[PDB]
Amino acid sequence: QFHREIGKLFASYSNKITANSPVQYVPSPPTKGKVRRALSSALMPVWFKFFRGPLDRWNLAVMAKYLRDHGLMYDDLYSDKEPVFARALELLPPDIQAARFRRLMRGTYLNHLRLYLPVHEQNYDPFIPYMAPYVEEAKFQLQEEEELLGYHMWEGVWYSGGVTGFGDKEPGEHFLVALPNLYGAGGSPMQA
Amino acid sequence: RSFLCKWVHYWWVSRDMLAAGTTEVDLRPIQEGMTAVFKWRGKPVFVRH
């Protein structure tokens, strides 16, 4: 019985992994092996003074000036085409949300005109992390759904309801389900 | 309009054809009751005695 035997293989491996579980926080093992840690530690005094130092300083200068020209913050660079950030934006309070909207409007207009702001308008720190408390919550909420619902490749009915059947939940987002109607006036999913 | 005129003109007959020419025929060898046929400007011509 092939399937039950390979079951046995999988089960024993999982039990090994289970038996080694800690019961409390334990610091992660380093990201680099001891050889590379040694080599980096040896070459630090030259590499950081001549190359890495100036690279990491020039980078922040470039970023800051570009953000100040337009009056953006750093966390204004993230999109809502990203599910986690979409959730984070859903969880925002009114004031932060309104200010973000305003800054994005102004940045669009300024990049259209290609005119610098006066230097007295540029006196602020652009790298404040104002989205962090919300991104962490979004990550939690979207991780639990994977754990509790996404753990298997579920089976569906194909090309029915406007969805392909392989997992989508919004109609006509893929080519083989384009053009839902041939007559009439159509409609929108949001008005069902 | 210039574009359409050029495109129309491009379907017209070429500059090598010209359809010009003339020919002559000797009539000594013909016999009574016979019809001879000749070639002229792309078409056939009958000569009958």
Binding site: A86, L115, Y116, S188 | -
Partner: protein, 96 residues
């Protein structure tokens, strides 16, 4: 496209087909705003471009200096040195 919490409408009138793309990309005006526009028949429209020319040109040229020109100069250098190497080769290999 837009997140589902932005493209949720307040009205309930059916969206006409010719407006599809308009309401797929709906966004909320958080805080509201006020706008003013003048008809283009009552505006100057070639003087505003030249009036702001120097500022715009300074900005554009400043932005492109390091990223586009400096590697360009290096590449031009490399071409000149390649020409040197070739014009020396062609004599070494074939001239007595």
């Amino acid at each position: 496209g837009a997140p589902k919490f932005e493209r949720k409408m307040l009205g309930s009138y059916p969206v006409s087909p010719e407006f599809e793309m308009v309401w797929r990309d709906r966004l909320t005006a958080h805080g509201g705003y006020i706008q003013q526009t003048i008809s283009p028949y009552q505006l100057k429209f070639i003087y505003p471009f030249w009036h702001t020319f120097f500022a715009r040109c300074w900005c554009k040229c400043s932005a492109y200096a390091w990223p586009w020109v400096w590697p360009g100069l290096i590449t031009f250098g490399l071409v000149k040195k390649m020409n040197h190497d070739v014009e020396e080769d062609i004599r070494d290999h074939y001239w007595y």
